[PDB]
Amino acid sequence: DAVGTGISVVGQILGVVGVPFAGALTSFYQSFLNTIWPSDADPWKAFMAQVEVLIDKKIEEYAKSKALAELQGLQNNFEDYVNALNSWKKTPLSLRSKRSQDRIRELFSQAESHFRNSMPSFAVSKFEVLFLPTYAQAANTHLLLLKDAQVFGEEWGYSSEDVAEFYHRQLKLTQQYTDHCVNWYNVGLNGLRGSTYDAWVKFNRFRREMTLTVLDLIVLFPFYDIRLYSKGVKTELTRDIFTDPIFSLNTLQEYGPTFLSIENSIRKPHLFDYLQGIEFHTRLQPGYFGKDSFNYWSGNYVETRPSIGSSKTITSPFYGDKSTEPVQKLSFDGQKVYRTIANTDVAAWPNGKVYLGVTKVDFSQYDDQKNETSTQTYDSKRNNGHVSAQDSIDQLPPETTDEPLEKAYSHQLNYAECFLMQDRRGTIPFFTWTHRSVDFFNTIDAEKITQLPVVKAYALSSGASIIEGPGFTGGNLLFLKESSNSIAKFKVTLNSAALLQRYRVRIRYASTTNLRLFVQNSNNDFLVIYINKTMNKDDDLTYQTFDLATTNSNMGFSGDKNELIIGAESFVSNEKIYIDKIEFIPVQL
């Protein structure tokens, strides 16, 4: 499946990126070949067909076969290279010959060059939204390969000049490939904007599928720069994912909530939080003949708990209709809900009125602590049998199938919200999921470079707001309106090895002015960070607008109650400052 491969690749890359030199010295390439570059090229036909199905368009035959051809040549070159590479890696120094050198280089320049020149084949005119996943996937390989030049270049025989041409190229394409993907995503996304419920479900499916397959991959590209991130990288994807509405309004399609009411009712950008519990509200759906009436869940309240550092729960507004029957409360405090299976029911009226609603949902939860799996259920307590409906794994497959689901899932439940149908047909619920990569503990690694998404803070000041991300950061950003000393507070987790260490702090931001930022910890370290102008006010948030500001003073931590506050100095209104990640580098003096 296109999405399943995508999800699987992003899981492999996330782990490889956490290995020094982007895992360049491990056997990652073997798994990567089986998954993305298999001999039969099945994966490609899947990506090539994935978007046709989403925008309901097609890629002309010429364009489509040319692409598969370029892809055949690329798989070959690339596999050729990987084999020459395993050899090279195994060869004792003493046994490495000029023949080996000349040969491995010749292969590298061939794969890299073929890749460099193929790219346009997946970016054809009038076929950008439809070639998207293919492009992102080939791009990602070109970059995974170019970095190899910085790791092996010198022992392969390349000179300074040669090696630098590659680095320069790498920096230039990381930017280009990133921007291309975000650009065509917005173009396709916006092409699905309509006013209907139907228009929405299509709009939200492209949004999801393209995120799992492209945007989620594009965020990893910067960690291939093994000079800027030479220690391995510990990061996470924080964005929300909306699976499709729990059941399909077959004859009811027309009665679904409008586009705007759906996009204006959904929960806006916020600090990352976790599911605590769901309060189910139930009502009766009468069948015309009474014996065929059923209870279904009409509305709900949801409780979410903030990121580490704050326990206070957040109760959402009431969603949908108040119960007519008893309310059921489920609390998932301390559990990871990795799957939901809903069952539906119907009651057709002679006068043509058909009615639907959810009579049941099973929440398969997993407990990290006790390492136990269990289930929890919402049963309306009245139904004529079970028509089937949504199974989460079909939309959000796991990272591998040869792994127990509770150990291989890719997302966890985060929110549930009911929407009402027009002409009183009932309520259709929506679920929201977050990536399994999210560390609840905000752990700072002792060896690796750690990225702390700014949305992992547990508190924000009045002058700061969480805003929708540009597209290539894997989540949302913090916008700075009013500078204060406690713009945001975080609590982080360090282990013993991590406690004996000191850390240099780097900050990924985008700003229209130079300014000083301050970082404080409860260990009384106070660091001043001068950020510089990276864009003009009238600019858009593209790849080149973000940068890394750092300080030459480091900080250390103590014990188990570590907190971090970010402050800033005053700036005039009208200047835009966006902060994305706080990075910790273990200063090994």
UniProtKB/Swiss-Prot annotation:
<dbReference type="GO" id="GO:0005102">
    <property type="term" value="F:signaling receptor binding"/>
</dbReference>
<dbReference type="Pfam" id="PF03945">
    <property type="entry name" value="Endotoxin_N"/>
</dbReference>
<comment type="similarity">
    <text>Belongs to the delta endotoxin family.</text>
</comment>
<feature type="region of interest" description="Disordered">
    <location>
        <begin position="370"/>
        <end position="402"/>
    </location>
</feature>
<dbReference type="Pfam" id="PF00555">
    <property type="entry name" value="Endotoxin_M"/>
</dbReference>
<dbReference type="GO" id="GO:0030435">
    <property type="term" value="P:sporulation resulting in formation of a cellular spore"/>
</dbReference>
<dbReference type="InterPro" id="IPR008979">
    <property type="entry name" value="Galactose-bd-like_sf"/>
</dbReference>
<comment type="function">
    <text>Promotes colloidosmotic lysis by binding to the midgut epithelial cells of Coleoptera. Has moderate level of toxicity to southern corn rootworm.</text>
</comment>
<keyword id="KW-0843">Virulence</keyword>
<dbReference type="InterPro" id="IPR005639">
    <property type="entry name" value="Pest_crys_dom_I"/>
</dbReference>
<dbReference type="InterPro" id="IPR005638">
    <property type="entry name" value="Pest_crys_dom-III"/>
</dbReference>
<dbReference type="InterPro" id="IPR038979">
    <property type="entry name" value="Pest_crys"/>
</dbReference>
<keyword id="KW-0800">Toxin</keyword>
<dbReference type="InterPro" id="IPR001178">
    <property type="entry name" value="Pest_cryst_dom_II"/>
</dbReference>
<dbReference type="Pfam" id="PF03944">
    <property type="entry name" value="Endotoxin_C"/>
</dbReference>
<comment type="subunit">
    <text>Monomer.</text>
</comment>
<dbReference type="InterPro" id="IPR036399">
    <property type="entry name" value="Pest_cryst_cen_dom_sf"/>
</dbReference>
<dbReference type="GO" id="GO:0090729">
    <property type="term" value="F:toxin activity"/>
</dbReference>
<keyword id="KW-0749">Sporulation</keyword>
<dbReference type="GO" id="GO:0001907">
    <property type="term" value="P:symbiont-mediated killing of host cell"/>
</dbReference>
<dbReference type="InterPro" id="IPR036716">
    <property type="entry name" value="Pest_crys_N_sf"/>
</dbReference>
<protein>
    <recommendedName>
        <fullName>Pesticidal crystal protein Cry3Bb</fullName>
    </recommendedName>
</protein>
